[PDB]
Amino acid sequence: GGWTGMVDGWYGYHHQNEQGSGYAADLKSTQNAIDGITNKVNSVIEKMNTQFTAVGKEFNHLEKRIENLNKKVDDGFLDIWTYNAELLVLLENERTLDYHDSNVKNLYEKVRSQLKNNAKEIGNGCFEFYHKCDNTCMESVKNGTYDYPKYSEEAKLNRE
Amino acid sequence: GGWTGMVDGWYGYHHQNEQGSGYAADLKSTQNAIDGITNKVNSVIEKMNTQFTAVGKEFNHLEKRIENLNKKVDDGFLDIWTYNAELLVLLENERTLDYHDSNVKNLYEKVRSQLKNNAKEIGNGCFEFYHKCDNTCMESVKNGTYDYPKYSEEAKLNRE
Amino acid sequence: GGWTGMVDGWYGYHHQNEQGSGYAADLKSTQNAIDGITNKVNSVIEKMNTQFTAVGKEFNHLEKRIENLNKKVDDGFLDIWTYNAELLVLLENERTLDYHDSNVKNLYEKVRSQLKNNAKEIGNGCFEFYHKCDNTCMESVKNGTYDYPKYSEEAKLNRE
Amino acid sequence: TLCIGYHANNSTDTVDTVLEKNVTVTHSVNLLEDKHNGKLCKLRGVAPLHLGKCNIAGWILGNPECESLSTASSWSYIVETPSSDNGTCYPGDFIDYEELREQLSS
Amino acid sequence: HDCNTTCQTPKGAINTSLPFQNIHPITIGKCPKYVKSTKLRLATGLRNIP
Ligand SMILES: *[C@@H]1O[C@H](CO[C@@H]2O[C@@H](C)[C@@H](O)[C@@H](O)[C@@H]2O)[C@@H](O)[C@H](O)[C@H]1NC(C)=O
Ligand SMILES: *[C@@H]1O[C@H](CO)[C@@H](O)[C@H](O)[C@H]1NC(C)=O
């Protein structure tokens, strides 16, 4: 589940260590996610460019066949737009939710890649360090700069 | 390839151990897959809500231009629906097949997560246990309750 | 980033070892990717099957309402096709790019599966062998036949 | 050993997708109807008005050969055969015939 | 015939509820849309590869 206490972006990290605890949004991921979503929503709206029209038409009592043709035209257009719009919404909502799931999955893998054998994969997005990992260490991991070799000795000594 | 002998659901497990062998559907996965597919098929059909119409129109020999307009209307609607329907089917069939592939991929990962270093990943969806894993053990793995620590000693002793 | 020097297919490998270096396309992957893309492009074009039509219609000055109906018909069809076409292109371009990303991701995993503990995952699609892996060894890996057990002794000796 | 797999059967049903063609699948449905029952039915609970060998002009004017037709109190649609030749028997212009046919259709 | 439908074509009534039909372009009723396609087969299952 998500963090109702994390309101500075869509995705982010929470930590607990010897020196303290808290959370922060991962704004590289969140901003990319935002640009993705923003472009998507705008394309849905911005591409549907209409012109000035006048829909209503008037016919007399001896023109029933023409009025009915006009109705036929309105009905076909109405069914097409209503149906396509429902499918577009349903399809995009599933894709949107998968996109979001992708972005957070990517962050997990980036962290795992840096930590390698110096942390346990436990669950709830958590990596349990096998060595002391203080605030400097955790910021280094979040920023993509974890210097794995300097922590590998401690990680194995705490397991041997 | 799939199991032609497994007809109690779309996804499931097969095992062989000291106490016996056989297979069973994973009904958590299968039911979720079913609800997904059912909602998808129903949305495709259930959203296309039409009204009572009468398509045919009649014109005389001095109304050729109107009859031709009526044809123009029928043809445009026909091309739109035929084309969109073909794309919808082709697109959804690919998405459907990916969805199914996703659900079974997810089951593999859940098992791998529980087994960790107590089984070898060999292929054909198989995890080879490095320790005796009897019917109780395998049911525990399938149900998400494998008690990894009680099998880790045996798994390493059979490898050391 | 890609290789501007690799022009014999969309996906492939590059290597460096004691006996030499170079690259080659993975044509199993590239051909499958091509068939996928070819079928996709062709379905977009080949399914939109039109008939012989004549669009223009002529009306006199006392038929303004009919001419306007004809315009209404042309405009509705135009808005539908323009919009759907833009969405189809935008949607497919994203799916196309994901498809390509999938195919190359799959190749990485196939290699990783064969190499197991005999190579380090370093990045830029690279697996660093922990043992001598000459041209015969690398071709064996690319072809799906790496005989892992014959290299595992050397790989651990170079790490112990 | 514990293995994760999936269902297979004897289905020969194939579908096409955007990336591949003739894919055999285990379960499949149509979105397309290609059957009808071969009958003209009551529409929304009301019977059609069948005119036999007469067309509407014949029926409404009283062509002598349409005398055998029954009078419907209501109808959902009108059915004429491709051979509904008995119409106007004294030649002339039936004015606004198409509009009358539309008004009497239901 | 003494039968009842929701959609009627000249070749006979349509009994059914799927979104498209390829029976006839001229219909009366709460009808499926006419298409030129001969097959709109939507997979519900997985690839049948034994
Ligand atoms: C797609 O399949 C259609 C149905 O044919 C069946 O599957 C193919 C792959 C062959 O095994 C055939 O003997 C089967 O009956 C074919 O009519 C069609 O031509 C195939 N591809 C196309 C559309 O050309
Ligand atoms: C439609 O036909 C059924 C018999 O199949 C009958 O029971 C029902 O009453 C009929 N409906 C109407 C409106 O006549």
Ligand SMILES: *[C@@H]1O[C@H](CO)[C@@H](O)[C@H](O)[C@H]1NC(C)=O
């Ligand atoms: C045909 O209509 C009857 C109602 O009279 C309904 O019970 C039956 O399921 C329909 N058949 C199909 C194939 O939809």
